[PDB]
């Protein structure tokens, strides 16, 4: 897997963001995670977490997996990095997301994220409190 550049266009919520990728606007859905919707508990905290992480990064990168790159709604499916740090993993580690939507072929970082979730659960963080 490799990292490609992109720039923030607009925050959306805990697990979606609007980025410019190869010069085109595109909504990205974070692979392998599920944040609560804004209207649910920890939803606002998830949204703020991602918003802040992505907007403070001076460099955003997009990392596609091996499988599908677009979902059925036209969203890009990727791991997103903020100055070298993976947002997908950071959400889980803080208990602001659950590992989820694990499909074969787009699951490279699965174990890495389950490791993060196991530690978040261990600490009773946010969703696991
Ligand atoms: C994360 C992810 C979601 N999806 C689809 C499955 C879900 O379908 P349904 O809409 O039929 O429930 C939806 C969940 O995303 P959200 O959590 O953004 O709603 O997005 C994929 O197809 N692949 C993925 O990798
Ligand atoms: Ca969600």
UniProtKB/Swiss-Prot annotation:
Subcellular location: Secreted
Binding site for Ca(2+): 15, 34-35
Active site positions, chain numbering: 29, 37, 75
Domain of life of the native organism: Bacteria
Region described as Disordered: spans on this chain: 109-129
Ranges of Basic and acidic residues composition bias in the record: 109-125
Name of the protein this chain belongs to: Nuclease A
Protein encoded by which gene: nuc
């Amino acid at each position: 897997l490799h990292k490609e550049p992109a720039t923030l266009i607009k925050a959306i919520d805990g697990d979606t963001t609007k980025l410019m990728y190869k010069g085109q606007p595109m909504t990205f859905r974070l692979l392998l995670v599920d944040t609560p919707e804004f209207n649910e508990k920890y939803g606002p905290e998830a949204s703020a977490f991602t918003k802040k992480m992505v907007e403070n990064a001076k460099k955003i990168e997009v990392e596609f997996d091996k499988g599908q790159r677009t979902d059925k709604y036209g969203r890009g499916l990727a791991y997103i990095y903020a100055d070298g740090k993976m947002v997908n993993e950071a959400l889980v580690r803080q208990g602001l997301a659950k590992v989820a939507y694990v499909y074969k072929g787009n699951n490279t970082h699965e174990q890495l994220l389950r490791k993060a979730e196991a530690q978040a659960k261990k600490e009773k963080l946010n969703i696991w409190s």
